[PDB]
Design a protein around this ligand. Structure first.
Ligand SMILES: COc1ccc(C2(c3cc(-c4sc(C)nc4C)[nH]n3)CC2)cc1
Ligand code: NA
Ligand code: NA
Length: 220
């Protein structure tokens, strides 16, 4: 039984070149803009992601919401040797697509795919995936989970001063609880990157929130 996600993967395999992540990105963006809409960061937002990756040169990245693997390919292709992407995907079939997408792109050695819910997997990272702290987190999963998973990352000790969080769709459909919290909290230094939705003629944006450390207890 044919699914949209299988169709995306098929289009890449036919038209992109194996071992060429850039051709894979172009294939998906072409498919989604010309053939069939799909939840896709798209190339405009993708360039903001690229710039963030290049600026901070993360050695360990956590992605929430891999879907078909476009963002995983986008980020992993800019990771240095020894750098790692951990990506989480709650749907088993999408997780399988993401693995095949990364395999095709030649990036499978840089990426660990975890199939499960963010709130179940995030607390296992220190013990099971030998994580200390994360250099960067990309949020693009269920929008009502941005705030609680950010709070969970903090309390699990996975954030350090300087950790970049980059969150997509903070305007459309919107994550106002997440935005209120990080912008108002002194634990996060925030900036907003506006970008037009490729399909919709509505303005969206990514929020970049840089962790400053835990807030200090009240003194004497
Ligand atoms: C209806 O809107 C959607 C639907 C699906 C998605 C995707 C997604 C979400 C997750 C979740 S959810 C959760 C609690 N932990 C994880 C890891 N993995 N992949 C991207 C496929 C994003 C937005
Ligand atoms: Na998105
Ligand atoms: Na803030």
């Amino acid at each position: 039984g044919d699914t949209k996600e299988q169709r995306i993967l098929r289009y890449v395999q036919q038209n992109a070149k194996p071992g060429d992540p850039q051709s894979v990105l172009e294939a998906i963006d072409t498919y989604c803009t010309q053939k069939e809409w799909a939840m896709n960061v798209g190339d405009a937002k993708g360039q903001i992601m690229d710039a963030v990756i290049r600026e901070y040169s993360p050695s360990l990245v956590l992605e929430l919401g891999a879907y078909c693997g476009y963002s995983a390919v986008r980020m992993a292709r800019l990771l240095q040797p020894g750098a790692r992407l951990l990506t989480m995907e709650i749907n088993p079939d999408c997780a399988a697509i993401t693995q095949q997408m990364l395999n095709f792109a030649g990036l499978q050695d840089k990426v660990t795919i975890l199939n499960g819910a963010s709130q179940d997997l995030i607390p296992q990272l220190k013990k099971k995936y030998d994580v200390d702290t994360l250099d960067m987190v990309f949020l693009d999963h269920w929008k009502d989970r941005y705030l609680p998973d950010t709070l969970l990352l903090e309390e699990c000790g996975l954030l350090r001063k300087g950790t970049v969080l980059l969150a997509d769709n903070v305007i459309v459909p919107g994550t106002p609880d997440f935005l209120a919290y990080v912008r108002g909290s002194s634990s996060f230094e925030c900036t907003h990157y506006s970008s037009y939705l490729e399909y919709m003629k509505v303005v969206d944006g990514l929020e970049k929130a840089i962790y400053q450390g835990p807030s200090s207890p009240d003194k004497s």
